[PDB]
């Protein structure tokens, strides 16, 4: 039991996150109301105090005489799903014949979509994101040609054996999900759930993944968070002999059922690496176009 | 009646006679983790008053040429008071914060500081200048401790992002002709219910002069900026021996 | 089997097609979603948050970039001199490019709505002054003098306790939506010009600086909406990202 | 359709309307969602809110 | 294999077969083979008027 | 026929796709299923059955393999000496690999739950002793001495009639699920260390052995669950199986 | 999957076929149609002028 | 010695908080574990070879030739089930021909 | 669907929910099954069960 | 930094010319006798 007053009247423990604001429906843009000339002392909408940290609450109606306008412009196209549920390139896998990279008939792709600017800049607008996704795999030769080749794609989650060759025992794929398809067939396409161990993936992790002294050698792990590492995507020509043709697989991702939290300033310097926000120091450019003077267009 | 305020929590009280309201980050107050969101099974410890109080950690000098600084939470308190001890003895930690940046001058000084909070504030390097070197920021820079760290390139917040858009984050301004402090309440922000106070900095505090300090020869030239902050609804779990990193 | 017949479109992969695809992990259940502050539901929410407008987008060397974030005002000669000017076109190259509104605006072909710019004076408390900020709807050339600028939509700002003032750039358009304006025939969608003039003069007493700065913050009104998704004009990548 | 509730948006305030042919909910289309929005969360997160006609600092 | 892409006013026009714009992260694109039947899509009324 | 249009995915063979396939033997009826003891419905049932944990996974020559199944205790010098240590990570290389839990755990990418290890003393009835078994949550290095180990979650075991004692390795994690931990960045998912120390000392009278062994059995608690099927890291085959 | 069987006509593109095609811009809403004088509904209206 | 697993629970070994656990147990059912198609047999039909240079081949229906699949089913002694078999054919280079 | 009851799980305690297009039940999908489980069958098959708080051997 | 760890007030000069520091009663005993150097420092109140 609890008998001492400070304990009874304590707030220690309420899990109810009291919120100052709530969402209202807004299918269309706000209408404009008729307004007239106001010559008052005391009331002053135009004057603000930006130091407070809130945006101006001054409206059209109070700054000029307005007419009535019934605004039925839709706000549907700016929802997260409308913005993100458009498939874009996030990975390329090369399977050349007599080359340097993969002359063995197979390839392992670390599942990381940060190798392409377009898609990357979009998702990096938010800090945390939770979503399902539709992946489409387009394959063809380097000339965009289609040939009668059978391929096998396999998802190798963290902990599963990564194939070390075109003939690796791992391709038995008894538990991992695999897809067999011909280049002649249409692009393979599957749905992928939200697989993180966290409640959301995060494009930014200001921290280290483990304890201990964080000496120079291990500074490569700064910002690396396992909750964002979903695994490996392996592909191979299905055979015991080298394929007769060189191949390329372009991976497209289309997010769906999206939720995001914490907006961030949008990237304004060229991207350099997948794992970090490093930018070219001798080449810091302004965010946009510049002009000769502040008094001339 | 909005320019005057008092913040009392724990055995500490702050007063200001030139405030500009209070910001409550993302519109919500700090709160303890519910039994639904929680996942770890051990009963947490909630020290309350011994750790949820105002700690005044550091003072910087504002100069006509200052670039701006940043501090990281909870990195700043990990070695201070009873809060620090709990952060070290426990694996798991979570809390909110009440931040109060102070900076007063005279009615003849001018200048404006942008005080903001940026969740998951990852730092980048200039990549060897040419962008061909894959360098990484050292521990001393990602977790600067109480001393904070001075920004190298404010325009891009040392992370390839425009400071012009930093206002999309909870923030206030300290415009010397208007107020002498900024106050921001921040709730726990993370994709997990609890986390390590040591390996993960939930957010960063940025204090950057957007409008340079200025005054006439003869006015006090030493204008300090002091950082005071208080954890809120601190919870700790996963007890063991003390660990500093 | 059941009689079917294939139509055009068969086998095509449309990147925006919203269809159904076979799930790779049957019976997989995702980690529960806990509460996280700051969830955003619609990009329009972000368009109403003010961000700094680089009215002074002239310096370009790295050490002077922070200067773009603000323009100055100082004691003049009382001839209602010009302080600064800039196009109001939010989706056009120029000042608006520094704002989140302008950036997001970059992902939509068309937009419609009133915009607003709030100016914050950061001079000393002893400094005073009155400015005339005007918005000149389409067709009007850059105002020769203040007398001309004054004929349009404007606000006369008086420095004081309230550090800021808000200029509303009301939606005055012939069409219900504007596409991004730019030099050429697409200037048809231009919004107009914004010009700042000294209404009286920046006055200050002995002991206070002769020059102070103004910071401009901009965002959209609540009647603002955008339509027709398109990729942004920038692609922040030169070679492959390693 | 009586399936598995494994969609990323299961238990979300915004009401979705989708199509699906598999036992797993995440395989469903993106569909249409509710058009609610809360600007104030980011544009006006002040403790004591001020009116449009008043002087913000008093 | 071909790629068709709709580039609305303001979006980057591809300047080459390898242009970064073909990443098509937001524009609508269609990938189809000459062997496949004619690609076919529906287009709404897009004018500002 | 009825107008249809083929979408991407057409013709693909997804190994986990749960579809319908034409039956080869129409009207075939299978042999009736009689009653058979021990039917299992869910792998979790097996994860709660204790199996021997090879804490002493050091000897490797064939003739000494059975020794891995148990570790010793014997009269010490009363300095609270260290008896044994092992990582609690169930899906990691090491002791847990000998348990059915660890093996089954190998077929899932992620797991979540409290584990338990029961230690059985097999010394003579005349032998007595008190041990301190401790679980050190993440971040804590291998305990230097007993005084340090004692600061974590622990049990002080007293030998007696009840031959065994149970150490519960409660689920103390930052994330709702852990992926298999291992050296590298994935150590983020480590569970922690388990260490056994002499609380007092192994005491025995004249006529009884100076050394006895402890057998460790481990399994999962009822809040344990696993998700995301994946193939096990081992493939017990070198060439073709004839 | 469900047993189907393709009939003649498959893959053909008839210019007057009135079918359904996938929309390129999901959730796009066109500009409102204001009032415009002189709308014509049927060519026969013009044949009487 | 009794032969039963320990019945000791978290609540009785340490002071615990309340945790509402909604983690699903669906993915560990027998069908979830086994209903994933895996390789169980290979048949070769070579031209001028040793094994089958006659154009046909007889495969004794036994899935125990591949470790992955085998180790999984051998976890149980008796098993009763229906099955879906898929046959993937191509030349040794993974090529597709009109055969 | 009125078909043949020739599925391997016909007459099973666990309730299945499946899809099918043929007269033979075994051609159906795997579907979802009931989530019942009985650990004690393997983890606690003692004749006289003992409580958690008692001394197992008395 | 050390002083800050105790009971304190952060005073901001302004219109209100004054501020009040409360030296709350934090004692082991219900009453203190006059403190002074020696064993009677047991009754000391503290430092400001
Ligand atoms: C039969 C094989 O088919 N499987 C296809 C497939 C496709 C995608 C799969 O997982 C995709 C996971 C991605 C949506 C995760 C992308 N993310 C999550 C956050 N993140 C990241 C990257 C770099 N820094 C921080 C976060 C990412 O790159 C798995 C299997
Ligand atoms: C038109 C032809 O299509 N027919 C395809 C087909 C495929 C499989 C067929 O039977 C598959 C039976 C297997 C599921 C039985 C596998 N088993 C049962 C137990 N068993 C075994 C093996 C070695 N030792 C003990 C048991 C096995 O290998 C029959 C026809
Ligand atoms: Cl201290
Ligand atoms: Na599909
Ligand atoms: Na399925
Ligand atoms: Na089939
Ligand atoms: Na049949
Ligand atoms: Na069509
Ligand atoms: Na659609």
mmCIF file of C-alpha atoms in Angstrom, chain F residues 53-227:
data_model
loop_
_atom_site.group_PDB
_atom_site.id
_atom_site.type_symbol
_atom_site.label_atom_id
_atom_site.label_comp_id
_atom_site.label_asym_id
_atom_site.label_seq_id
_atom_site.Cartn_x
_atom_site.Cartn_y
_atom_site.Cartn_z
ATOM 1 C CA UNK F 53 23.778 -26.990 -22.989
ATOM 2 C CA UNK F 54 27.456 -27.577 -23.750
ATOM 3 C CA UNK F 55 28.934 -24.988 -21.399
ATOM 4 C CA UNK F 56 32.158 -26.980 -21.555
ATOM 5 C CA UNK F 57 32.592 -26.826 -25.297
ATOM 6 C CA UNK F 58 36.376 -27.112 -25.259
ATOM 7 C CA UNK F 59 37.537 -30.706 -25.864
ATOM 8 C CA UNK F 60 37.233 -31.835 -29.503
ATOM 9 C CA UNK F 61 38.859 -35.240 -30.069
ATOM 10 C CA UNK F 62 36.232 -37.960 -30.638
ATOM 11 C CA UNK F 63 36.960 -39.907 -27.444
ATOM 12 C CA UNK F 64 36.372 -36.818 -25.278
ATOM 13 C CA UNK F 65 33.186 -35.434 -26.839
ATOM 14 C CA UNK F 66 30.899 -36.655 -24.040
ATOM 15 C CA UNK F 67 32.900 -34.397 -21.708
ATOM 16 C CA UNK F 68 31.459 -31.311 -23.389
ATOM 17 C CA UNK F 69 28.146 -32.274 -21.761
ATOM 18 C CA UNK F 70 29.206 -31.132 -18.279
ATOM 19 C CA UNK F 71 31.529 -28.879 -16.315
ATOM 20 C CA UNK F 72 33.206 -29.441 -12.939
ATOM 21 C CA UNK F 73 33.297 -27.887 -9.487
ATOM 22 C CA UNK F 74 35.676 -28.823 -6.649
ATOM 23 C CA UNK F 75 37.075 -27.582 -3.337
ATOM 24 C CA UNK F 76 38.626 -24.129 -3.787
ATOM 25 C CA UNK F 77 40.557 -21.626 -1.665
ATOM 26 C CA UNK F 78 37.560 -19.455 -0.740
ATOM 27 C CA UNK F 79 38.391 -16.440 -2.830
ATOM 28 C CA UNK F 80 35.041 -16.443 -4.657
ATOM 29 C CA UNK F 81 36.815 -17.902 -7.682
ATOM 30 C CA UNK F 82 35.318 -18.030 -11.203
ATOM 31 C CA UNK F 83 33.748 -21.344 -12.259
ATOM 32 C CA UNK F 84 32.630 -20.829 -15.874
ATOM 33 C CA UNK F 85 31.254 -18.238 -18.301
ATOM 34 C CA UNK F 86 29.294 -18.255 -21.571
ATOM 35 C CA UNK F 87 27.339 -15.872 -23.802
ATOM 36 C CA UNK F 88 23.573 -15.955 -23.390
ATOM 37 C CA UNK F 89 23.053 -15.351 -27.138
ATOM 38 C CA UNK F 90 20.936 -18.423 -28.077
ATOM 39 C CA UNK F 91 21.281 -18.077 -31.833
ATOM 40 C CA UNK F 92 25.064 -17.595 -31.755
ATOM 41 C CA UNK F 93 27.952 -20.049 -32.193
ATOM 42 C CA UNK F 94 28.914 -21.574 -28.910
ATOM 43 C CA UNK F 95 27.275 -23.632 -26.135
ATOM 44 C CA UNK F 96 23.669 -23.002 -27.206
ATOM 45 C CA UNK F 97 24.396 -24.817 -30.446
ATOM 46 C CA UNK F 98 24.004 -28.148 -28.624
ATOM 47 C CA UNK F 99 20.426 -27.331 -27.564
ATOM 48 C CA UNK F 100 17.316 -28.000 -29.608
ATOM 49 C CA UNK F 101 16.346 -24.405 -28.883
ATOM 50 C CA UNK F 102 19.502 -23.112 -30.506
ATOM 51 C CA UNK F 103 19.063 -25.385 -33.492
ATOM 52 C CA UNK F 104 15.413 -24.450 -34.149
ATOM 53 C CA UNK F 105 16.349 -20.874 -33.471
ATOM 54 C CA UNK F 106 18.611 -21.319 -36.505
ATOM 55 C CA UNK F 107 15.599 -21.388 -38.824
ATOM 56 C CA UNK F 108 14.376 -17.929 -37.817
ATOM 57 C CA UNK F 109 15.955 -14.534 -38.426
ATOM 58 C CA UNK F 110 14.539 -12.917 -35.306
ATOM 59 C CA UNK F 111 13.540 -14.044 -31.813
ATOM 60 C CA UNK F 112 12.100 -12.469 -28.668
ATOM 61 C CA UNK F 113 11.686 -13.851 -25.172
ATOM 62 C CA UNK F 114 13.145 -14.797 -21.808
ATOM 63 C CA UNK F 115 15.345 -17.890 -21.647
ATOM 64 C CA UNK F 116 16.113 -20.153 -18.704
ATOM 65 C CA UNK F 117 18.958 -22.471 -17.774
ATOM 66 C CA UNK F 118 18.582 -25.117 -15.121
ATOM 67 C CA UNK F 119 21.727 -26.452 -13.485
ATOM 68 C CA UNK F 120 21.778 -29.925 -12.002
ATOM 69 C CA UNK F 121 24.423 -30.881 -9.440
ATOM 70 C CA UNK F 122 25.568 -34.490 -9.744
ATOM 71 C CA UNK F 123 28.084 -34.667 -6.914
ATOM 72 C CA UNK F 124 27.713 -37.036 -3.952
ATOM 73 C CA UNK F 125 24.937 -36.594 -1.397
ATOM 74 C CA UNK F 126 27.521 -35.594 1.229
ATOM 75 C CA UNK F 127 28.769 -32.683 -0.869
ATOM 76 C CA UNK F 128 27.400 -29.196 -0.225
ATOM 77 C CA UNK F 129 28.020 -25.724 -1.583
ATOM 78 C CA UNK F 130 26.658 -22.354 -2.626
ATOM 79 C CA UNK F 131 27.198 -20.831 -6.095
ATOM 80 C CA UNK F 132 26.394 -17.390 -7.515
ATOM 81 C CA UNK F 133 25.144 -17.494 -11.112
ATOM 82 C CA UNK F 134 24.799 -14.129 -12.792
ATOM 83 C CA UNK F 135 23.387 -12.744 -16.016
ATOM 84 C CA UNK F 136 25.034 -9.516 -17.155
ATOM 85 C CA UNK F 137 22.798 -7.505 -19.528
ATOM 86 C CA UNK F 138 24.361 -5.864 -22.633
ATOM 87 C CA UNK F 139 27.188 -3.367 -22.177
ATOM 88 C CA UNK F 140 28.726 -5.064 -19.184
ATOM 89 C CA UNK F 141 32.149 -6.608 -19.882
ATOM 90 C CA UNK F 142 33.011 -10.072 -18.626
ATOM 91 C CA UNK F 143 32.955 -9.535 -14.819
ATOM 92 C CA UNK F 144 36.463 -9.081 -13.417
ATOM 93 C CA UNK F 145 35.548 -10.569 -10.033
ATOM 94 C CA UNK F 146 32.492 -11.905 -8.225
ATOM 95 C CA UNK F 147 31.788 -8.523 -6.640
ATOM 96 C CA UNK F 148 31.204 -7.098 -10.120
ATOM 97 C CA UNK F 149 29.158 -10.011 -11.437
ATOM 98 C CA UNK F 150 26.961 -9.722 -8.347
ATOM 99 C CA UNK F 151 25.677 -6.323 -9.568
ATOM 100 C CA UNK F 152 23.582 -7.920 -12.280
ATOM 101 C CA UNK F 153 20.656 -10.309 -12.347
ATOM 102 C CA UNK F 154 21.601 -13.354 -10.318
ATOM 103 C CA UNK F 155 20.713 -16.435 -8.313
ATOM 104 C CA UNK F 156 22.507 -17.829 -5.295
ATOM 105 C CA UNK F 157 22.207 -21.586 -5.488
ATOM 106 C CA UNK F 158 22.368 -23.789 -2.394
ATOM 107 C CA UNK F 159 23.153 -27.481 -2.972
ATOM 108 C CA UNK F 160 20.723 -29.841 -1.235
ATOM 109 C CA UNK F 161 17.822 -32.285 -1.699
ATOM 110 C CA UNK F 162 16.616 -30.373 -4.773
ATOM 111 C CA UNK F 163 19.463 -31.193 -7.119
ATOM 112 C CA UNK F 164 18.792 -28.282 -9.453
ATOM 113 C CA UNK F 165 18.292 -24.525 -9.654
ATOM 114 C CA UNK F 166 17.026 -22.288 -12.446
ATOM 115 C CA UNK F 167 18.600 -19.110 -13.740
ATOM 116 C CA UNK F 168 16.132 -17.010 -15.636
ATOM 117 C CA UNK F 169 17.689 -14.871 -18.347
ATOM 118 C CA UNK F 170 14.841 -12.323 -18.479
ATOM 119 C CA UNK F 171 14.230 -10.510 -21.699
ATOM 120 C CA UNK F 172 16.075 -7.213 -21.283
ATOM 121 C CA UNK F 173 16.341 -5.717 -24.767
ATOM 122 C CA UNK F 174 16.148 -2.326 -26.386
ATOM 123 C CA UNK F 175 14.320 -3.753 -29.428
ATOM 124 C CA UNK F 176 11.220 -5.964 -29.390
ATOM 125 C CA UNK F 177 13.154 -8.650 -31.289
ATOM 126 C CA UNK F 178 16.803 -9.578 -31.669
ATOM 127 C CA UNK F 179 18.330 -10.955 -34.860
ATOM 128 C CA UNK F 180 21.059 -13.575 -34.423
ATOM 129 C CA UNK F 181 23.972 -11.848 -32.769
ATOM 130 C CA UNK F 182 27.561 -12.250 -33.929
ATOM 131 C CA UNK F 183 30.872 -10.390 -34.034
ATOM 132 C CA UNK F 184 30.581 -7.122 -35.906
ATOM 133 C CA UNK F 185 27.766 -4.603 -36.040
ATOM 134 C CA UNK F 186 25.303 -7.379 -35.289
ATOM 135 C CA UNK F 187 26.621 -7.563 -31.738
ATOM 136 C CA UNK F 188 23.980 -4.868 -31.279
ATOM 137 C CA UNK F 189 21.608 -7.807 -30.709
ATOM 138 C CA UNK F 190 23.733 -9.511 -28.078
ATOM 139 C CA UNK F 191 21.905 -10.824 -25.033
ATOM 140 C CA UNK F 192 24.726 -10.766 -22.495
ATOM 141 C CA UNK F 193 26.993 -12.926 -20.352
ATOM 142 C CA UNK F 194 26.300 -15.662 -17.823
ATOM 143 C CA UNK F 195 28.937 -16.344 -15.197
ATOM 144 C CA UNK F 196 29.128 -18.845 -12.360
ATOM 145 C CA UNK F 197 31.119 -18.134 -9.193
ATOM 146 C CA UNK F 198 31.768 -19.930 -5.921
ATOM 147 C CA UNK F 199 29.598 -18.131 -3.373
ATOM 148 C CA UNK F 200 31.167 -20.083 -0.514
ATOM 149 C CA UNK F 201 32.958 -23.320 -1.435
ATOM 150 C CA UNK F 202 32.385 -26.949 -2.480
ATOM 151 C CA UNK F 203 32.717 -28.807 0.817
ATOM 152 C CA UNK F 204 32.887 -32.536 1.238
ATOM 153 C CA UNK F 205 33.798 -34.939 4.053
ATOM 154 C CA UNK F 206 36.424 -37.662 4.207
ATOM 155 C CA UNK F 207 35.437 -40.440 1.817
ATOM 156 C CA UNK F 208 33.775 -38.404 -0.900
ATOM 157 C CA UNK F 209 35.225 -37.235 -4.265
ATOM 158 C CA UNK F 210 36.906 -33.825 -4.503
ATOM 159 C CA UNK F 211 35.405 -33.223 -7.897
ATOM 160 C CA UNK F 212 31.846 -33.441 -9.138
ATOM 161 C CA UNK F 213 30.068 -32.216 -12.249
ATOM 162 C CA UNK F 214 27.179 -29.926 -13.125
ATOM 163 C CA UNK F 215 24.867 -30.550 -16.078
ATOM 164 C CA UNK F 216 23.189 -27.529 -17.673
ATOM 165 C CA UNK F 217 19.788 -27.746 -19.346
ATOM 166 C CA UNK F 218 18.277 -24.831 -21.255
ATOM 167 C CA UNK F 219 15.039 -23.849 -22.979
ATOM 168 C CA UNK F 220 12.783 -20.827 -23.545
ATOM 169 C CA UNK F 221 10.135 -19.213 -21.318
ATOM 170 C CA UNK F 222 6.500 -18.900 -22.437
ATOM 171 C CA UNK F 223 6.931 -15.373 -23.825
ATOM 172 C CA UNK F 224 9.417 -16.679 -26.406
ATOM 173 C CA UNK F 225 8.510 -16.408 -30.121
ATOM 174 C CA UNK F 226 10.452 -16.326 -33.384
ATOM 175 C CA UNK F 227 9.808 -14.688 -36.736
#
